[PDB]
Amino acid sequence: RIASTTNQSQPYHLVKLIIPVCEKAKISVFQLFGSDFKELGKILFGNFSLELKL
DNA sequence: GTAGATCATGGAATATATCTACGCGTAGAT
Structure with missing residues (x-):
């Protein structure tokens, strides 16, 4: 949420943010x-067993 | 003759990007 509220052009910390995020997302x-x-989106929905379809 | 014992006698608010000072590792010269 903080990374999406700060300026988008600002880079994201790879090991601190993206790798754990995709890890918890099982991706x-x-x-x-x-x-x-x-x-x-389809793989995320299947991973968390959601009924959404984008 | 007298004192003691005995007997009579009794109705109904948090995280994060940013600014700044410091030691310093390394770069440059020879």
Whole structure:
């Protein structure tokens, strides 16, 4: 939330923020930076067993 | 003859980006 409230052009701390975030999301860094928004959303919804569909 | 014992005698608010001072590791010269 802080990273999304601060200026978006500001870089994010890799090991401090992104790697733990994708870790808790059960998502590889490759999947996060490579897949499009549709695939990422579908995989996130399946990972947390949500019923959403983007 | 007298004192003691005995007997009679009795109705109904938190995290984070930013600014600043300091030691200092390394760069530069020879």
